[PDB]
Design an enzyme around this catalytic site. Structure first.
Site, short mmCIF file in Angstrom:
data_model
loop_
_atom_site.label_atom_id
_atom_site.label_comp_id
_atom_site.label_asym_id
_atom_site.label_seq_id
_atom_site.Cartn_x
_atom_site.Cartn_y
_atom_site.Cartn_z
CD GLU A 15 5.30 25.73 59.99
OE1 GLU A 15 4.25 26.10 59.99
OE2 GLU A 15 6.27 26.35 60.54
CB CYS A 110 4.68 27.12 63.40
SG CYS A 110 5.18 28.71 63.05
CG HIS A 129 7.74 29.99 65.67
ND1 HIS A 129 7.91 31.51 65.70
CD2 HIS A 129 8.55 29.55 64.93
CE1 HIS A 129 9.11 31.71 65.41
NE2 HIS A 129 9.32 30.61 64.68
#
Ligand SMILES: [Mg+2]
Lengths: 190, 190
Positions: A15, A110, A129
Protein backbone atom coordinates in the site's frame (compact mmCIF):
# COMPACT_ATOMS: atom_id res chain seq x y z
CA UNK A 1 1.29 19.50 -6.64
CA UNK A 2 3.04 18.07 -3.68
CA UNK A 3 2.25 14.74 -2.02
CA UNK A 4 2.84 13.43 1.49
CA UNK A 5 2.76 9.65 1.93
CA UNK A 6 2.54 9.06 5.67
CA UNK A 7 4.34 6.01 7.01
CA UNK A 8 4.74 4.42 10.44
CA UNK A 9 6.25 1.28 11.86
CA UNK A 10 3.83 -1.39 10.72
CA UNK A 11 2.82 0.31 7.44
CA UNK A 12 2.03 -2.13 4.64
CA UNK A 13 4.71 -2.34 1.94
CA UNK A 14 2.29 -2.88 -0.95
CA UNK A 15 0.00 0.00 0.00
CA UNK A 16 3.01 2.30 0.45
CA UNK A 17 4.72 1.35 -2.83
CA UNK A 18 1.80 1.70 -5.24
CA UNK A 19 0.98 5.42 -4.69
CA UNK A 20 4.73 6.09 -4.28
CA UNK A 21 5.59 4.58 -7.64
CA UNK A 22 2.60 6.11 -9.43
CA UNK A 23 3.34 9.67 -8.30
CA UNK A 24 7.05 9.24 -9.05
CA UNK A 25 6.16 8.12 -12.59
CA UNK A 26 3.93 11.19 -12.88
CA UNK A 27 6.88 13.39 -11.91
CA UNK A 28 4.81 14.79 -9.05
CA UNK A 29 6.90 15.56 -5.95
CA UNK A 30 6.29 13.12 -3.11
CA UNK A 31 7.81 12.75 0.35
CA UNK A 32 7.42 9.92 2.83
CA UNK A 33 6.69 11.36 6.26
CA UNK A 34 7.32 9.08 9.23
CA UNK A 35 5.33 9.07 12.43
CA UNK A 36 7.21 7.07 15.05
CA UNK A 37 9.99 6.75 17.60
CA UNK A 38 12.97 5.95 15.41
CA UNK A 39 15.33 8.93 15.36
CA UNK A 40 17.02 7.91 12.10
CA UNK A 41 13.74 7.66 10.17
CA UNK A 42 14.29 3.96 9.77
CA UNK A 43 10.90 2.30 9.49
CA UNK A 44 10.10 -1.36 10.16
CA UNK A 45 7.22 -1.98 7.75
CA UNK A 46 4.32 -4.40 8.37
CA UNK A 47 6.00 -7.38 6.65
CA UNK A 48 9.50 -6.55 7.89
CA UNK A 49 11.02 -4.41 5.16
CA UNK A 50 13.35 -1.81 6.70
CA UNK A 51 13.03 1.48 4.75
CA UNK A 52 14.24 5.15 5.35
CA UNK A 53 11.53 7.71 5.26
CA UNK A 54 12.41 11.06 3.74
CA UNK A 55 11.14 13.08 6.70
CA UNK A 56 9.87 12.82 10.22
CA UNK A 57 6.55 14.52 10.93
CA UNK A 58 8.33 16.24 13.82
CA UNK A 59 9.96 18.45 11.18
CA UNK A 60 6.59 20.06 10.43
CA UNK A 61 5.49 22.44 13.18
CA UNK A 62 1.71 22.30 12.70
CA UNK A 63 -1.08 21.11 10.44
CA UNK A 64 -1.37 24.60 9.00
CA UNK A 65 2.33 24.40 8.10
CA UNK A 66 1.72 20.99 6.58
CA UNK A 67 -0.99 22.50 4.43
CA UNK A 68 1.48 25.11 3.21
CA UNK A 69 3.80 22.30 2.03
CA UNK A 70 1.53 19.53 0.71
CA UNK A 71 -1.63 19.21 -1.35
CA UNK A 72 -2.31 15.48 -0.98
CA UNK A 73 -2.11 13.42 2.22
CA UNK A 74 -2.05 9.62 1.90
CA UNK A 75 -2.61 7.20 4.76
CA UNK A 76 -1.69 3.63 3.98
CA UNK A 77 -2.72 0.54 5.94
CA UNK A 78 -1.21 -2.40 7.66
CA UNK A 79 -2.66 -3.07 11.12
CA UNK A 80 0.03 -1.51 13.29
CA UNK A 81 0.84 1.34 10.90
CA UNK A 82 -2.79 2.32 10.60
CA UNK A 83 -3.28 2.10 14.39
CA UNK A 84 -0.45 4.56 14.85
CA UNK A 85 -1.37 6.95 12.03
CA UNK A 86 -5.10 6.98 12.78
CA UNK A 87 -4.44 7.83 16.45
CA UNK A 88 -1.92 10.61 15.83
CA UNK A 89 -3.50 14.06 16.27
CA UNK A 90 -1.21 15.60 13.66
CA UNK A 91 -2.52 13.18 11.02
CA UNK A 92 -6.11 13.73 12.09
CA UNK A 93 -5.62 17.52 12.01
CA UNK A 94 -4.25 17.37 8.47
CA UNK A 95 -7.17 15.22 7.34
CA UNK A 96 -9.71 17.56 8.94
CA UNK A 97 -8.05 20.60 7.45
CA UNK A 98 -7.89 19.09 4.00
CA UNK A 99 -11.43 17.68 3.87
CA UNK A 100 -13.61 19.56 1.39
CA UNK A 101 -10.90 22.06 0.63
CA UNK A 102 -10.38 23.09 -2.93
CA UNK A 103 -7.28 21.57 -4.48
CA UNK A 104 -6.47 19.37 -1.47
CA UNK A 105 -6.95 15.59 -1.54
CA UNK A 106 -6.90 12.79 1.06
CA UNK A 107 -6.33 9.11 0.40
CA UNK A 108 -6.76 6.26 2.89
CA UNK A 109 -6.36 2.54 2.18
CA UNK A 110 -7.12 -0.71 4.19
CA UNK A 111 -6.99 -0.10 7.96
CA UNK A 112 -5.90 3.43 7.05
CA UNK A 113 -9.52 4.16 6.23
CA UNK A 114 -10.17 4.11 9.99
CA UNK A 115 -8.62 7.60 9.92
CA UNK A 116 -11.93 8.87 8.50
CA UNK A 117 -13.69 7.62 11.65
CA UNK A 118 -11.14 8.90 14.23
CA UNK A 119 -10.81 12.37 12.68
CA UNK A 120 -14.62 12.73 12.67
CA UNK A 121 -15.00 13.09 8.86
CA UNK A 122 -18.64 13.51 7.85
CA UNK A 123 -18.54 11.69 4.52
CA UNK A 124 -21.50 9.36 4.05
CA UNK A 125 -19.86 6.49 2.21
CA UNK A 126 -16.49 4.74 2.57
CA UNK A 127 -14.65 1.59 1.87
CA UNK A 128 -11.77 -0.13 3.58
CA UNK A 129 -10.47 -3.59 4.29
CA UNK A 130 -13.28 -6.14 4.83
CA UNK A 131 -11.63 -6.74 8.20
CA UNK A 132 -12.53 -3.19 9.16
CA UNK A 133 -15.93 -3.03 7.46
CA UNK A 134 -17.87 -3.45 10.72
CA UNK A 135 -15.77 -0.76 12.42
CA UNK A 136 -16.43 1.58 9.50
CA UNK A 137 -20.16 0.87 9.46
CA UNK A 138 -20.19 1.27 13.24
CA UNK A 139 -19.09 4.87 12.58
CA UNK A 140 -22.17 5.46 10.44
CA UNK A 141 -20.49 5.17 7.02
CA UNK A 142 -22.21 3.20 4.32
CA UNK A 143 -19.68 0.62 3.19
CA UNK A 144 -19.30 0.05 -0.54
CA UNK A 145 -17.80 -3.27 -1.60
CA UNK A 146 -15.85 -1.89 -4.54
CA UNK A 147 -12.11 -1.34 -4.90
CA UNK A 148 -12.26 2.42 -4.42
CA UNK A 149 -14.66 5.10 -3.21
CA UNK A 150 -14.44 8.82 -3.83
CA UNK A 151 -16.61 11.26 -1.86
CA UNK A 152 -15.78 14.94 -1.88
CA UNK A 153 -11.94 14.95 -1.88
CA UNK A 154 -11.57 11.72 0.12
CA UNK A 155 -10.45 8.59 -1.69
CA UNK A 156 -10.73 5.31 0.23
CA UNK A 157 -9.77 1.80 -0.86
CA UNK A 158 -9.82 -1.77 0.36
CA UNK A 159 -6.47 -3.54 0.47
CA UNK A 160 -3.18 -4.52 -1.04
CA UNK A 161 -4.93 -5.77 -4.15
CA UNK A 162 -6.51 -2.36 -4.73
CA UNK A 163 -3.40 -0.24 -4.01
CA UNK A 164 -2.71 0.39 -7.68
CA UNK A 165 -6.33 1.41 -8.35
CA UNK A 166 -6.12 3.65 -5.28
CA UNK A 167 -2.93 5.40 -6.41
CA UNK A 168 -4.42 5.88 -9.83
CA UNK A 169 -7.64 7.37 -8.42
CA UNK A 170 -5.54 9.93 -6.51
CA UNK A 171 -3.47 10.74 -9.57
CA UNK A 172 -6.60 11.13 -11.71
CA UNK A 173 -7.75 14.04 -9.54
CA UNK A 174 -4.60 16.09 -10.08
CA UNK A 175 -3.09 15.10 -13.42
CA UNK A 176 -4.21 16.19 -16.84
CA UNK A 177 -6.03 13.46 -18.78
CA UNK A 178 -3.00 13.35 -21.05
CA UNK A 179 -0.57 12.72 -18.19
CA UNK A 180 -2.91 10.33 -16.45
CA UNK A 181 -3.29 8.26 -19.58
CA UNK A 182 0.45 8.08 -20.22
CA UNK A 183 1.20 6.96 -16.62
CA UNK A 184 -1.67 4.49 -16.74
CA UNK A 185 -0.44 2.94 -19.98
CA UNK A 186 3.05 2.49 -18.55
CA UNK A 187 1.79 0.32 -15.70
CA UNK A 188 0.35 -2.63 -17.63
CA UNK A 189 -2.92 -2.62 -15.73
CA UNK A 190 -4.71 -5.88 -16.26
CA UNK B 1 9.80 -23.78 0.59
CA UNK B 2 12.07 -20.74 0.84
CA UNK B 3 12.02 -17.79 -1.51
CA UNK B 4 14.77 -15.46 -2.76
CA UNK B 5 13.64 -12.06 -4.00
CA UNK B 6 16.61 -10.58 -5.90
CA UNK B 7 17.04 -6.83 -5.66
CA UNK B 8 19.45 -4.34 -7.21
CA UNK B 9 19.83 -0.60 -7.22
CA UNK B 10 17.06 0.47 -9.59
CA UNK B 11 14.65 -2.35 -8.71
CA UNK B 12 11.01 -1.31 -8.91
CA UNK B 13 9.33 -0.81 -5.51
CA UNK B 14 5.90 -2.11 -6.63
CA UNK B 15 7.31 -5.28 -8.19
CA UNK B 16 9.40 -5.98 -5.11
CA UNK B 17 6.65 -5.36 -2.60
CA UNK B 18 3.89 -7.50 -4.13
CA UNK B 19 5.65 -10.91 -3.98
CA UNK B 20 7.28 -9.87 -0.71
CA UNK B 21 3.96 -9.16 0.97
CA UNK B 22 2.22 -12.17 -0.56
CA UNK B 23 4.85 -14.67 0.66
CA UNK B 24 4.97 -13.01 4.06
CA UNK B 25 1.17 -13.37 4.40
CA UNK B 26 1.57 -17.02 3.35
CA UNK B 27 4.11 -17.52 6.17
CA UNK B 28 6.63 -18.81 3.64
CA UNK B 29 10.21 -17.73 4.36
CA UNK B 30 11.51 -15.06 1.98
CA UNK B 31 14.84 -13.23 1.84
CA UNK B 32 15.83 -10.24 -0.23
CA UNK B 33 19.21 -10.83 -1.89
CA UNK B 34 21.03 -7.71 -3.10
CA UNK B 35 23.16 -7.62 -6.22
CA UNK B 36 25.21 -4.43 -5.98
CA UNK B 37 28.13 -2.95 -4.22
CA UNK B 38 26.85 -1.14 -1.13
CA UNK B 39 28.49 -2.96 1.84
CA UNK B 40 25.64 -2.19 4.17
CA UNK B 41 23.08 -3.83 1.83
CA UNK B 42 21.32 -0.48 1.44
CA UNK B 43 19.49 -0.35 -1.87
CA UNK B 44 18.31 2.71 -3.80
CA UNK B 45 15.20 1.46 -5.57
CA UNK B 46 13.97 2.62 -9.03
CA UNK B 47 11.77 5.40 -7.67
CA UNK B 48 14.19 6.40 -4.86
CA UNK B 49 13.07 4.34 -1.89
CA UNK B 50 16.07 3.47 0.28
CA UNK B 51 15.75 0.11 2.02
CA UNK B 52 17.97 -2.69 3.45
CA UNK B 53 18.21 -6.06 1.80
CA UNK B 54 18.57 -9.11 4.01
CA UNK B 55 21.64 -10.56 2.22
CA UNK B 56 24.24 -9.85 -0.45
CA UNK B 57 24.53 -12.32 -3.32
CA UNK B 58 28.27 -12.43 -2.49
CA UNK B 59 27.36 -14.57 0.55
CA UNK B 60 26.35 -17.42 -1.78
CA UNK B 61 29.24 -19.11 -3.61
CA UNK B 62 27.49 -20.77 -6.59
CA UNK B 63 24.16 -21.52 -8.18
CA UNK B 64 24.37 -25.09 -6.85
CA UNK B 65 24.77 -23.68 -3.35
CA UNK B 66 21.93 -21.19 -3.92
CA UNK B 67 19.71 -24.09 -4.87
CA UNK B 68 20.26 -25.73 -1.51
CA UNK B 69 19.07 -22.55 0.24
CA UNK B 70 16.12 -21.47 -1.90
CA UNK B 71 13.33 -23.01 -3.93
CA UNK B 72 11.95 -19.93 -5.71
CA UNK B 73 14.04 -17.20 -7.39
CA UNK B 74 12.29 -13.94 -8.24
CA UNK B 75 13.73 -11.30 -10.60
CA UNK B 76 11.80 -8.03 -10.34
CA UNK B 77 11.88 -5.20 -12.89
CA UNK B 78 12.46 -1.52 -12.98
CA UNK B 79 14.57 -0.35 -15.86
CA UNK B 80 17.91 0.01 -14.06
CA UNK B 81 17.49 -2.88 -11.68
CA UNK B 82 16.48 -5.26 -14.45
CA UNK B 83 19.55 -4.35 -16.48
CA UNK B 84 21.80 -5.17 -13.52
CA UNK B 85 20.11 -8.41 -12.58
CA UNK B 86 19.80 -9.66 -16.19
CA UNK B 87 23.51 -9.04 -16.87
CA UNK B 88 24.84 -10.56 -13.60
CA UNK B 89 26.44 -13.98 -14.25
CA UNK B 90 25.37 -15.33 -10.84
CA UNK B 91 21.72 -14.52 -11.55
CA UNK B 92 21.91 -16.14 -15.01
CA UNK B 93 23.51 -19.20 -13.44
CA UNK B 94 20.76 -19.48 -10.82
CA UNK B 95 18.03 -19.16 -13.49
CA UNK B 96 19.68 -21.78 -15.66
CA UNK B 97 20.08 -24.15 -12.69
CA UNK B 98 16.45 -23.81 -11.32
CA UNK B 99 14.72 -24.24 -14.73
CA UNK B 100 12.60 -27.43 -14.99
CA UNK B 101 13.51 -28.68 -11.57
CA UNK B 102 10.53 -30.39 -10.02
CA UNK B 103 10.97 -28.64 -6.67
CA UNK B 104 12.00 -25.10 -7.68
CA UNK B 105 10.28 -22.08 -9.37
CA UNK B 106 11.50 -18.87 -11.27
CA UNK B 107 9.57 -15.61 -11.51
CA UNK B 108 10.46 -12.62 -13.66
CA UNK B 109 8.49 -9.39 -14.03
CA UNK B 110 8.60 -6.30 -16.41
CA UNK B 111 12.11 -5.73 -17.76
CA UNK B 112 13.37 -8.47 -15.47
CA UNK B 113 12.01 -10.92 -18.08
CA UNK B 114 15.05 -10.15 -20.17
CA UNK B 115 16.88 -12.49 -17.82
CA UNK B 116 15.16 -15.41 -19.64
CA UNK B 117 16.82 -14.34 -22.78
CA UNK B 118 20.22 -13.57 -21.21
CA UNK B 119 20.15 -16.97 -19.48
CA UNK B 120 19.28 -18.74 -22.76
CA UNK B 121 16.09 -20.34 -21.32
CA UNK B 122 14.25 -22.61 -23.77
CA UNK B 123 10.59 -22.03 -22.84
CA UNK B 124 8.40 -21.28 -25.86
CA UNK B 125 5.90 -18.78 -24.45
CA UNK B 126 6.43 -15.79 -22.18
CA UNK B 127 5.24 -12.35 -21.20
CA UNK B 128 6.93 -9.21 -19.90
CA UNK B 129 6.56 -5.45 -20.07
CA UNK B 130 5.35 -4.33 -23.47
CA UNK B 131 8.54 -2.27 -23.79
CA UNK B 132 10.60 -5.50 -23.91
CA UNK B 133 8.23 -7.42 -26.17
CA UNK B 134 10.40 -6.94 -29.26
CA UNK B 135 13.48 -8.12 -27.43
CA UNK B 136 11.69 -11.20 -26.11
CA UNK B 137 10.43 -12.03 -29.61
CA UNK B 138 13.91 -11.63 -31.08
CA UNK B 139 14.89 -14.33 -28.60
CA UNK B 140 12.42 -16.73 -30.20
CA UNK B 141 9.75 -16.47 -27.53
CA UNK B 142 6.08 -16.19 -28.31
CA UNK B 143 4.85 -13.16 -26.39
CA UNK B 144 1.44 -13.42 -24.77
CA UNK B 145 -0.29 -10.12 -24.02
CA UNK B 146 -1.76 -11.01 -20.63
CA UNK B 147 -0.89 -10.38 -17.02
CA UNK B 148 0.86 -13.67 -16.11
CA UNK B 149 2.26 -16.62 -18.08
CA UNK B 150 3.47 -19.97 -16.68
CA UNK B 151 5.52 -22.46 -18.67
CA UNK B 152 7.28 -25.34 -16.96
CA UNK B 153 8.35 -23.72 -13.66
CA UNK B 154 8.84 -20.19 -15.03
CA UNK B 155 6.29 -17.42 -14.22
CA UNK B 156 6.67 -14.14 -16.26
CA UNK B 157 4.58 -10.97 -15.94
CA UNK B 158 4.19 -7.53 -17.50
CA UNK B 159 4.53 -4.59 -15.11
CA UNK B 160 3.70 -2.87 -11.85
CA UNK B 161 -0.01 -3.36 -12.54
CA UNK B 162 0.43 -7.13 -12.71
CA UNK B 163 2.75 -7.54 -9.72
CA UNK B 164 0.01 -8.84 -7.44
CA UNK B 165 -1.18 -11.37 -10.01
CA UNK B 166 2.48 -12.39 -10.51
CA UNK B 167 3.10 -12.95 -6.85
CA UNK B 168 -0.09 -14.95 -6.60
CA UNK B 169 0.89 -17.18 -9.54
CA UNK B 170 4.17 -17.97 -7.74
CA UNK B 171 2.36 -18.69 -4.51
CA UNK B 172 -0.09 -20.94 -6.36
CA UNK B 173 2.77 -23.31 -7.23
CA UNK B 174 3.75 -24.00 -3.63
CA UNK B 175 0.80 -23.33 -1.34
CA UNK B 176 -1.95 -25.73 -0.36
CA UNK B 177 -5.38 -24.91 -1.75
CA UNK B 178 -6.43 -23.73 1.73
CA UNK B 179 -3.44 -21.43 2.16
CA UNK B 180 -3.68 -20.00 -1.36
CA UNK B 181 -7.38 -19.21 -0.98
CA UNK B 182 -6.89 -17.61 2.43
CA UNK B 183 -4.04 -15.39 1.28
CA UNK B 184 -5.98 -14.49 -1.87
CA UNK B 185 -9.06 -13.48 0.05
CA UNK B 186 -7.02 -11.30 2.43
CA UNK B 187 -5.71 -9.14 -0.42
CA UNK B 188 -9.06 -7.70 -1.52
CA UNK B 189 -8.24 -8.41 -5.14
CA UNK B 190 -10.43 -6.31 -7.47
MG1 LIG C 1 29.51 1.65 8.22
Amino acid sequence: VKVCLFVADGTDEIEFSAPWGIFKRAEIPIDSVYVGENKDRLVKMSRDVEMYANRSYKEIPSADDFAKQYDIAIIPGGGLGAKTLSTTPFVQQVVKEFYKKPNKWIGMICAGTLTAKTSGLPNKQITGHPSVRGQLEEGGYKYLDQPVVLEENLITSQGPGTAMLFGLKLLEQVASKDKYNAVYKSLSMP
